[PDB]
RNA sequence: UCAGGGAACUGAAACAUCUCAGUACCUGAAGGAGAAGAAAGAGAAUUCGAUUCCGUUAGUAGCGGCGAGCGAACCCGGAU
RNA sequence: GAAACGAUGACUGAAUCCGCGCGGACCACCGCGCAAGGCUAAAUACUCCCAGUGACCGAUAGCGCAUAGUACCGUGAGGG
RNA sequence: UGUUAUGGCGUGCCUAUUGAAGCAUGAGCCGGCGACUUAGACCUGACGUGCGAGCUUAAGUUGAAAAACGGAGGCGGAGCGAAAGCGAGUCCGAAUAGGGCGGCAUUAGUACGUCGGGCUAGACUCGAAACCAGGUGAGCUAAGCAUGACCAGGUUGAAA
RNA sequence: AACCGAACCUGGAGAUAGCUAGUUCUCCCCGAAAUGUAUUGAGGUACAGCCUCGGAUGUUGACCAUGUCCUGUAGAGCACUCACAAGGCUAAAACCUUAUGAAACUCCGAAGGGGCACGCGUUUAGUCCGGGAGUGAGGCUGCGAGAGCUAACUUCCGUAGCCGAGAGGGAAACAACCCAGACCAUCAGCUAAGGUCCCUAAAUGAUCGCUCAGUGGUUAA
RNA sequence: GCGACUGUUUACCAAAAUCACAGCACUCUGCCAACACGAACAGUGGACGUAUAGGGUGUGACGCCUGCCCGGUGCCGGAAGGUCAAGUGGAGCGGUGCAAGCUGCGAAAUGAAGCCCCGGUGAACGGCGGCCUAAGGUAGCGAA
RNA sequence: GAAUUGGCUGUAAAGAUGCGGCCUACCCGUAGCAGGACGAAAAGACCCCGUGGAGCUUUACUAUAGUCUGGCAUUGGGAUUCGGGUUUCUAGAAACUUGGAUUUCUAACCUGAAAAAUCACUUUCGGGGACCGUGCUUGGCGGGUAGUUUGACUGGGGCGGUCGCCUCCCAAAAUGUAACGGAGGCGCCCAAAGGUCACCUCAAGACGGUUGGAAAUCGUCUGUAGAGCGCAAAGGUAGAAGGUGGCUUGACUGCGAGACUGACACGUCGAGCAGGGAGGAAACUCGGGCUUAGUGAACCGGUGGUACCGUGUGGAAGGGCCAUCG
């Protein structure tokens, strides 16, 4: 039963951070479910990674615990 | 042997195969869909073989 | 003298261009495939990067 | 030089095909040389014109566990 | 290998100039050539031997030997 | 300069190593011999020379107290593609999304030479256990064969 | 034919040798690695990562400040899951007062850490194109953890510094500890760690106390 | 205790309980024998021998004796059926020719030995067990 | 190695004449002894390592001497029954067979005796006999022989375990991070568990209720959730991804601006463009599934298209491209 098992690192985390200029198609956070939630200007991939539609300054919205959003300001 | 299988699709007079077959568990003999070969139109795909 | 390694030629590694080494895209050869339709298509023509010096002298005369 | 026989270490980062190599070695025959030589050819121009040697073709065309690696000929320029 | 052509070991086994062989499975056309008889100098290789030469040695170098296949070792092949 | 007394200080050399005065390797001493080379019209760079949108010869011929000749051929000059092929365009494709590429930065190339690397070949020098080929050995020793030789003296007491 | 699990001699033959050993003149400049992936791989190689040389660019580098977002460790807490201490209530789960533990618990949650902008400020490295590498056995201490007996000059990761390649002073001696990074000369001066009775450079220093054990100069219940 | 016995061995650390040995047993072998050396339709050895002989294997004077298990493997027989190569066969499928013809494949049926399959065989390889396998220790011995 | 070579105790790579402190010791020999100089000798035979070797073994792999076997050749007439061939002729049979098969024959061939020992010759002669032997080929057997293979991690090796993928601690509040550390899953599923359109909202407890009564089923009230999501956990989820129906396939072809991640090679997410669909009244959403596991480069080949190559030309064999399978 000696159990030497484990699983390769998943480079999950917040990629682009607050006040970074971004581009269309940049991947802005990696997550399992929706810790951070889509928000305006921002799509969300099939694996729940949200990502930019438009270019510009980035996000910052976090009052709802379990209700936090990313966004893009032209 | 096996349950689920691979199965070729053949166009109503086209060519284009598409070989994404699913279970023999409940589709005991059924296998018809629709998608376009080389003519632009979506057409009927009998997935017999 | 100096052979070309004929494992380079009709294999991926076109030598061509401004001296840079194109190669192909690999997985899902004709080994079996269900899998996605946007990967079965995205297997056309790649091009490598930090190995080129090795690839070049495989085939420096561009066969 | 030609012929009758014909290895293995080795490389393939193991080893069978493969390579090493028709190499080493043994044997036969002959001479100052020898072999080869006068197209049922090369080859794609209805071109060429016995053989041998050198340059180049060209590491091209190809061969190959299509792996390691092996590798021509024609045209053309010379010696005769 | 789609593997032609030459090559023999075994068994078979044609045709004549409106004929025979090839042109890389094979076919037609179109081309190239006359097999199963022989000889054939020169351009090529090599260095026991001789001559000349050397950004070759000069006595632990240079051939093993400034001479020796000697002394010496071995039953020998052989080494030296 | 030579040599001394006395004070202070002071753990051979190399190699191999996390770590050597090491009680870890090597070595008695001195002399001499002794190890990154060569090759090829091979690749790829640095530096230098000649000629430059063009550069250059190979085999050879003729001359040699000397070198000229020799364009066969090699490198630039067009790219994209599996290829046929098109061609400053090309490939994928039913057109518009891309890959590579020319423009613009036209970095200018080529033949030599010296050098740094690479490849191939003993490839920095020395060191196997082993594998294969053709020979030499049964004058030692293991055996066989043919022909010869040898065994003081004493005790025991079988068949018939 | 004085070494027979396969004789001796000569030849292939300079077999092959990811293995050992050895690799010689001089000064100057820079200066590493023992990490990560893959490997019939583990003491070998390939690609990265760190060195150097040349070219291009030209502060893009470095600390430090301000602004902004990201985080669930320390601590803490019991509101979920598990464990769990004394009572009441009752057919005992549950429920109430009191009370706790947690790497795989979290109603909370720092210091720190990272990304971006700015340079509001001092510095001087950076990046890209090429030629040459070596390295891929690391070790010790403090801190943070697992494995271990809360052993080990143990082992395996993280993190800083030293040795590795670091001479000099201190620690009696002493790679790692303390101070400090050796261009060359001087029979000149100041300090650091650490010292000032004699070996042994320098107060038998000054003022308050303490210990009469050689405690100093060897653990505890 | 072991081996019956004389004898033989590790030249150079083992002389023995090792080897051989008389005796016994299985099997093979009809004579250009089996078997063995051999490039060889050569020649030899067996052997100028012929089954009371020769080869091979294992036991090991002599005495009393040598038990159970043919499933597996080996071997000897069987040889209804299954499988199986070259060859014979060439129905049919294609190219290429205007055609004649040339040409690439190519079946069914029939083709040996062998193996599957069935019997036997132990002085054939062997096996005689753990609180189903083919059977499970006959005599004799036993802390060797 | 060179030596001008003492004792204790301490340190140093951990057993010190040689480093530190302290003790002892005038210079040099001769006869003796055997504690030390990790004394000498053989670059450890144990052990581990090397993708080293060699001897041997077998039901490891692969060949092969040897040997058995079918066909053909040497190799020949005959009689006999002949599945059949051809011209023969009042379903039919004589010239004849292409053969197979017992049977039989003697000129091949083998072998033996006779003044001529191996061989050659006649043989009144003898026996075997188209078998054997031999030559090519087919298949079997073939440790007799031969060339080789026989992984790695590993608190020494072996034995046991373990080799890829996913989840959570460890992992030190960014990503990352080892251990033969601690836990647990995958090598699939789903013709609907997918697209869209529309509509419902779950556990759990309390009172009351037909056989059930701790728990079936209904009914009321509580009810950020204490459920569920195909499976492992973690995140996430109440405006749903959960539970239910209607239509249908976007479980699409041609592409891919930009980024996450990796030494590569792979891997991930993807707005938007075209052809054509699907659901919706529309806006709009569709290029599989809440997400993270359900996986294999290359080589060689099978199957379907395409008409690029195809060696004098025109084809075809063969090859390439696209799709798929192993
Ligand atoms: Mg286990
Ligand atoms: Mg190209
Ligand atoms: Mg070999
Ligand atoms: Mg090899
Ligand atoms: Mg071989
Ligand atoms: Mg020679
Ligand atoms: Mg000769
Ligand atoms: Mg002669
Ligand atoms: Mg000519
Ligand atoms: Mg022909
Ligand atoms: Mg021929
Ligand atoms: Mg032709
Ligand atoms: Mg000289
Ligand atoms: Mg001499
Ligand atoms: Mg001398
Ligand atoms: Mg000599
Ligand atoms: Mg002598
Ligand atoms: Mg003599
Ligand atoms: Mg002195
Ligand atoms: Mg050590
Ligand atoms: Mg030291
Ligand atoms: Mg010493
Ligand atoms: Mg020493
Ligand atoms: Mg050593
Ligand atoms: Mg010594
Ligand atoms: Mg050249
Ligand atoms: Mg040449
Ligand atoms: Mg461009
Ligand atoms: Mg040059
Ligand atoms: Mg290199
Ligand atoms: Mg070599
Ligand atoms: Mg030999
Ligand atoms: Mg003798
Ligand atoms: Mg006498
Ligand atoms: Mg007497
Ligand atoms: Mg001897
Ligand atoms: Mg002697
Ligand atoms: Mg030997
Ligand atoms: Mg050598
Ligand atoms: Mg050789
Ligand atoms: Mg080797
Ligand atoms: Mg410096
Ligand atoms: Mg990996
Ligand atoms: Mg390593
Ligand atoms: Mg590197
Ligand atoms: Mg620079
Ligand atoms: Mg920067
Ligand atoms: Mg800056
Ligand atoms: Mg805590
Ligand atoms: Mg509160
Ligand atoms: Mg500034
Ligand atoms: Mg570089
Ligand atoms: Mg260099
Ligand atoms: Mg390491
Ligand atoms: Mg470490
Ligand atoms: Mg513990
Ligand atoms: Mg340690
Ligand atoms: Mg080191
Ligand atoms: Mg340092
Ligand atoms: Mg120091
Ligand atoms: Mg010091
Ligand atoms: Mg000191
Ligand atoms: Mg100390
Ligand atoms: Mg220390
Ligand atoms: Mg030091
Ligand atoms: Mg002072
Ligand atoms: Mg001070
Ligand atoms: Mg003083
Ligand atoms: Mg005082
Ligand atoms: Mg006893
Ligand atoms: Mg005896
Ligand atoms: Mg002896
Ligand atoms: Mg002897
Ligand atoms: Mg003795
Ligand atoms: Mg005979
Ligand atoms: Mg005889
Ligand atoms: Mg016995
Ligand atoms: Mg018995
Ligand atoms: Mg007793
Ligand atoms: Mg100590
Ligand atoms: Mg001591
Ligand atoms: Mg001392
Ligand atoms: Mg001293
Ligand atoms: Mg003595
Ligand atoms: Mg050793
Ligand atoms: Mg081997
Ligand atoms: Mg045979
Ligand atoms: Mg055969
Ligand atoms: Mg063997
Ligand atoms: Mg076998
Ligand atoms: Mg191992
Ligand atoms: Mg983290
Ligand atoms: Mg951290
Ligand atoms: Mg690590
Ligand atoms: Mg643990
Ligand atoms: Mg829904
Ligand atoms: Mg509609
Ligand atoms: Mg889209
Ligand atoms: Mg096909
Ligand atoms: Mg053609
Ligand atoms: Mg075709």
From Swiss-Prot, chain A:
In the record, biological process GO terms are:
translation
Q: Name one GO cellular component term.
A: cytosolic large ribosomal subunit
Do the record's keywords include RNA-binding? yes
Looking at the record's lineage, which domain of life comes first?
Bacteria
Q: Name one GO molecular function term.
A: tRNA binding
The UniProt keyword set, sorted, is: Ribonucleoprotein, Ribosomal protein, RNA-binding, rRNA-binding, tRNA-binding
Coiled-coil residues: none
Function comment: Binds the 5S and 23S rRNAs and also the tRNA in the P site.
Q: Which family does it belong to?
A: Belongs to the bacterial ribosomal protein bL27 family.
Q: How does it assemble?
A: Part of the 50S ribosomal subunit. Contacts protein L18.
Q: What is this protein called?
A: Large ribosomal subunit protein bL27
Query: To which species is this protein native?
Result: Deinococcus radiodurans (strain ATCC 13939 / DSM 20539 / JCM 16871 / CCUG 27074 / LMG 4051 / NBRC 15346 / NCIMB 9279 / VKM B-1422 / R1)
Residues represented out of the complete protein: 10 to 83 of 91
Curated annotation (Swiss-Prot), chain B:
Name the PANTHER family on file. 54S RIBOSOMAL PROTEIN L39, MITOCHONDRIAL, LARGE RIBOSOMAL SUBUNIT PROTEIN BL33M
**GO CC, one annotated term:** cytosolic large ribosomal subunit
In terms of NCBIfam families, this protein maps to: PRK00595.1, rpmG_bact
| Subunit structure of this chain's protein | Part of the 50S ribosomal subunit. Contacts protein L35.
Native source organism of the sequence: Deinococcus radiodurans (strain ATCC 13939 / DSM 20539 / JCM 16871 / CCUG 27074 / LMG 4051 / NBRC 15346 / NCIMB 9279 / VKM B-1422 / R1)
Gene this chain is encoded by: rpmG
Q: What does this protein do?
A: Binds the 23S rRNA and the E site tRNA.
Q: Name one GO molecular function term.
A: rRNA binding
What is the name attached to this protein's record? Answer: Large ribosomal subunit protein bL33
- Supply the alphabetized keyword list: Ribonucleoprotein, Ribosomal protein, RNA-binding, rRNA-binding, tRNA-binding
Tell me which HAMAP family the record gives. Ribosomal_bL33
Which is an annotated Pfam family here?
Ribosomal_L33
Q: Which GO terms describe its biological process?
A: translation
The similarity annotation says: Belongs to the bacterial ribosomal protein bL33 family.
Q: Which Gene3D superfamilies match?
A: Ribosomal protein L33 (2.20.28.120)
- Superkingdom of the source species: Bacteria
Curated annotation (Swiss-Prot), chain C:
One GO MF annotation is: structural constituent of ribosome
Coiled-coil region list: none
A single GO BP: translation
- The answer to whether keyword Aminoacyl-tRNA synthetase applies is no
UniProt keyword Ribonucleoprotein, yes or no? yes
The record, for HAMAP family, names: Ribosomal_bL35
Query: In UniProt terms, what function does this protein have?
Result: Binds the 23S rRNA.
Relate the assembly described in the record.
Part of the 50S ribosomal subunit. Contacts proteins L15 and L33.
Q: Record's family?
A: Belongs to the bacterial ribosomal protein bL35 family.
* Annotated protein name in UniProt: Large ribosomal subunit protein bL35
- Which species is listed as the source? Deinococcus radiodurans (strain ATCC 13939 / DSM 20539 / JCM 16871 / CCUG 27074 / LMG 4051 / NBRC 15346 / NCIMB 9279 / VKM B-1422 / R1)
Q: Quote the gene name from the UniProt entry.
A: rpmI
